Amino acid sequence: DDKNQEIIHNGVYLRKITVANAKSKNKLRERLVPEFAWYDKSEAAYAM
RNA sequence: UAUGUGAUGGAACCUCUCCGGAUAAUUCUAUCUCUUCUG
């Protein structure tokens, strides 16, 4: 995909979200965060 | 809009005095961006 005026997220996976602390253990963990299409349609690293 | 037997006003140089001057290498590396949902 490419950039659009609708700016609706179309993506999944990548990145490890940092938690705002946890009840048991506080450490980095990977989550399936939604993301927007890159703007490449050096235009090699972009997300939302 | 004068008044008459009498007008050198062509009868007078806006003249004189004062450095557009002083100071400045056309040079060059650390991020940028804020909301994530109990995890």
Side-chain angles (χ1 to χ4, degrees), chain A residues 8-11 36-41:
Chain A
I8 56 171
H9 294 88
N10 45 2
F36 188 73
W38 57 84
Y39 321 136
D40 203 15
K41 305 179 184 292

Side-chain angles (χ1 to χ4, degrees), chain A residues 7-47:
Chain A
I7 66 170
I8 56 171
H9 294 88
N10 45 2
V12 75
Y13 181 72
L14 186 56
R15 263 83 177 185
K16 298 183 183 293
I17 184 64
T18 187
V19 292
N21 212 3
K23 189 261 291 173
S24 66
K25 169 77 191 135
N26 47 1
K27 188 62 66 68
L28 196 56
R29 186 59 178 83
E30 194 273 333
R31 206 262 290 169
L32 294 191
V33 56
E35 61 209 12
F36 188 73
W38 57 84
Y39 321 136
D40 203 15
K41 305 179 184 292
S42 66
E43 288 274 19
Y46 281 126

